[PDB]
Amino acid sequence: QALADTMKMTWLMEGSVNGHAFTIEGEGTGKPYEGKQSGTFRVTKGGPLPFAFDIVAPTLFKCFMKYPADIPDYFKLAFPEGLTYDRKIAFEDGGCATATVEMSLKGNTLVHKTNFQGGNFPIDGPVMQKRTLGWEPTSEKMTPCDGIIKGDTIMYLMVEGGKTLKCRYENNYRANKPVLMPPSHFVDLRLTRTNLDKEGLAFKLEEYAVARVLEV
Amino acid sequence: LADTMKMTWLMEGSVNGHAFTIEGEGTGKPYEGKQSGTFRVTKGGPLPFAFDIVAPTLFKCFMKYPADIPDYFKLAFPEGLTYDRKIAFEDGGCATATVEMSLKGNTLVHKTNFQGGNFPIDGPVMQKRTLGWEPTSEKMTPCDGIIKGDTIMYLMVEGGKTLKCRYENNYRANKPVLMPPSHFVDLRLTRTNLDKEGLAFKLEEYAVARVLEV
């Protein structure tokens, strides 16, 4: 196994949203084969953020998924060499972002590095007014194509006052020269945000993700 | 709805300025989530575009639901349900459709107006190089008495290629009904050609609901 039953992780995310630069650093622990992970994050530059931390939380780790033995796990098979992915994030109100993530392995630690560029968020929208309340669970479609996995998801961001904001993710997960691909499948996931202060400089995230094929 | 129902379809529209009409008749088992129909292009045929782009718009009351999840689409009957749909292909082809589903005796009546445009002249849709839709799962999200349907579906293309499509659906029951929680509906839609000219087709679908266990 390139990945052990328990792994440590680190995150470094740099970017800008509506021209506001920021840096987030994190450390965590996860169980790759159980599909569980958690981490503690700090906004080390540009905090308190003028935008909802929720917009970067799903971009803060695809090798943490529970797969049945009869479905190849592209994200773990990518290790030890690692995986890089690009991501398009599009909200229904015109807010958008593009991110590039590199996942690498250093001993017992999985290293996650991201550059996140966001723009066109409405000034009075829930993201810039920080009126969000975490993401509703959803299912990511995983479609193999030309040695990459295309991830496609519709995810709703919860908003204060019983409202929601729809978001579409288009992900392209690229391992180096893969020779085994899974069939098309889905990965169900729940991402929970825990605030660690009142100011918005520290957060904890937890995720559970599990793969399945449709029975149709 | 009875265990077995008859259905009729009337779809009128235009794609890249080309007008067409499709009529169909079929039978299904609403509670088993199974349906099939035979379709004929009665005006504007042979179509200059792939029949596959209208096939997912040709019937939400045919879904297998477990007893502990309310079935919005069946609870909408006998009053019926109307929905709007946005269809967006990754190459810029797009369509908007409005579907009215009604009940008249033992027959479910499906009426659609489908407007499509901006399909690339050399793309798989206008070159009729498609091979049916890959199965997928539709997200169903209740919102103020309606169900928002959201799906990413891949259309198979000759030569081992695909064309991604996004559907954004708004299902509106004609009378308020008990609402389900957010869930997904897995489905497989199969097309079978009934002729060589492209005037007749058979479609079949199996759809089954699931709540996530996360």
Residue numbers in the entry:
A (entry chain A): 6 to 65, 69 to 224
B (entry chain D): 8 to 65, 69 to 224
Question: What does the paper behind this entry write?
Answer:
Anthozoan chromoproteins are highly pigmented, diversely coloured and readily produced in recombinant expression systems. Here, high-resolution X-ray crystal structures of four open-source chromoproteins, gfasPurple, amilCP, spisPink and eforRed, are presented. Like GFP, chromoprotein monomers have a β-barrel structure that contains a chromophore, which is autocatalytically constructed from adjacent X–tyrosine–glycine residues encoded within the protein sequence itself.
